[PDB]
Design a protein around this ligand. Sequence first.
Ligand SMILES: *[C@@H]1O[C@H](CO)[C@@H](O)[C@H](O)[C@H]1NC(C)=O
Ligand SMILES: [Zn+2]
Lengths: 595, 195
Amino acid sequence: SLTEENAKTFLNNFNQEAEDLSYQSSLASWNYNTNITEENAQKMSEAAAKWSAFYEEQSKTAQSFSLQEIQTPIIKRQLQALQQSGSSALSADKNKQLNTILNTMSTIYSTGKVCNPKNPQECLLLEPGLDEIMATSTDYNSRLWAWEGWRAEVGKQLRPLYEEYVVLKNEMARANNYNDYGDYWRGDYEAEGADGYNYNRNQLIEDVERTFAEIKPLYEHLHAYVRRKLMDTYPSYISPTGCLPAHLLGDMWGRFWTNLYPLTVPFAQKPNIDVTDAMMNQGWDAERIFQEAEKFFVSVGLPHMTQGFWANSMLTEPADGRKVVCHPTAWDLGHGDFRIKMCTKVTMDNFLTAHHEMGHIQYDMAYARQPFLLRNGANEGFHEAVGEIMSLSAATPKHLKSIGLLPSDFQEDSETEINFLLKQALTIVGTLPFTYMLEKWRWMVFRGEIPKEQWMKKWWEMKREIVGVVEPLPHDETYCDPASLFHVSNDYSFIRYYTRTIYQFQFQEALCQAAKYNGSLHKCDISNSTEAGQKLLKMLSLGNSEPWTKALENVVGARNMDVKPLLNYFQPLFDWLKEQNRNSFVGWNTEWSPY
Amino acid sequence: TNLCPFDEVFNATRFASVYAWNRKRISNCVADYSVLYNLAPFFTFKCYGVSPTKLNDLCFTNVYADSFVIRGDEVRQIAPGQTGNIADYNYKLPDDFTGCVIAWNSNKLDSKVSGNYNYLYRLFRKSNLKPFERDISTEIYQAGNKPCNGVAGFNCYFPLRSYSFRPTYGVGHQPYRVVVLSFELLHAPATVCGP
Ligand SMILES: *[C@@H]1O[C@H](CO)[C@@H](O)[C@H](O)[C@H]1NC(C)=O
Ligand SMILES: [Zn+2]
């Protein structure tokens, strides 16, 4: 009769057909990613085309119901989730222009080689043959050559394309009652309708600057330690007061400092125990790795794995005849179907990847009671933060000594703890300033605070003052350095990696205080604890039916990002850095330059 | 010994939809519920009004055997005093229901790799079904306040939908064959006694 009953019937008729069309496309995508041939790639196209056509046809009609006479929150949330047409607000021609512009940057980033000032018959592309120079090569005049040649060849043609990509995306978002495209990406954290749990959009800015301003001393100490450790291999190219060069890090862009461990190590005589040489002398398999991971989740209060999982999942590489994309993923086909595609080897890195991949299955298996529009995570950082604590718990020496992998003779030591905390330091704390700086630059560019003739003028001073990284060679206003990243040449939000880290430690501290633990945070696990693990299942049952500020309150108790489990996780490391950074200068100045 | 008319409703070859459930009459025979153990591993023999634990020695004047097919997550709706989609639009049981329900998984027979679009159910209806009522109409369900004129446009949908079973679904979506026996106790000579 009224708008409420009409909307209820409309949503029922939608959910009836949507959950059957969204199954054939996912099944075709699975069959293609597992048995890629000349026919599966063509069969995967029509299913997705029909699904997209149905989705647009249903979203174009789900707009006559005014969202003003709706008093129930569930129907209102489903209508709000169905009213986001995305890029369907642009015109007919502008759509094709934006489609052909985005593909050009993608094929430019995919292809493209580099030439050296030496004999030029060696043409290197982004194939792992090139990034090895930026990962394991220590000799100078090669890392700098590669770093300059990358932004020299493929960085020049991405400038005339990004200038139109910015103005085109600013018009697509202007039709969705937004301000710009930077405000469009910030809308995922918009939670409306609650008693006190209301979260505004713009607050997302004020909550990040307040958060990054608290990990500045720890990052400064780590940066000073890395700078002092790098002066033993490059004595004449590093200044003990200035910043670090843009190259010479452990990555092509400096996003992850993980490749600096063989150089920046506290104690080199320590073995850094590995359980890889423990399944050879006793006998393991790819099924035993996924069986010891299932036993982990049933000792906490989580359901078993369905019979269709062990029969339809690809847990190893095929023998012959087939070919796979070789990427561990967890597929939620729908209709009660859950699979995992991952080529598993008998190692330690694959033993911890099974837990991270099953952390997504236990999340998908748990919100399946939602009307097909609330079957997601709270926000973009909630889904990937659940799989991180499962790998954090399964890597402790306590969990490895309770399954038969580590003998009951070696307990712990103060040196291996520091060796482990530093390797984890240059994987989490080393990427937060980079992520913050990149997202801030992209937001200011999409807004308008940075003119078109000031991009590579404010891109580098921020990297000098925020990240503490200087450029080796000057870059005039014809380059495009951020566009060299994969997440910038293709439309991808980069802030999802900043919050996911914080949520990673807010969940771990709240789930380790429900198992009666008193030691260090980096030594606790949620195994054999039903209480610590039943509070998590309460949050993993809402999807996006409730505001993310309320689902976070059910597991940790707080309504916002309050990051000081991270300062408690790296407590034995932050105290060891202050004892070493004594006869040095903690900090940098944005005035020095190598050349 | 005139044995029961069973072995023709259980071991059938073609079941019926839930919105057009089949009904069979049983009279002038001998009830022999002692061979149902050889059937599927089914975990549903749920009886109300009578006792199943070795209390099959009563005499009835008539027996009504209904049969249909549903999904695995709706077998809980075939019970006295229940709500949902099937219980309100397809098959309703009274609160004084004397008799019982059996449900067994039929994934190996009623599922297809391309989708079993044969079985149907009812999704929309103006009102709920009376106990043991049945509707087979295919009229356009007018939701709004404008006429439909026989065409299904906006706020005017078709009331019948399909199941599309597949062997890769979960246990909550795999097909289940359901048989409901109801016992009548009239003032007539009870000719259905059983050993
Ligand atoms: C159906 O077939 C099975 C097969 O063993 C048999 O035992 C049973 O008596 C038959 N009839 C019924 C009603 O189950
Ligand atoms: Zn993951």
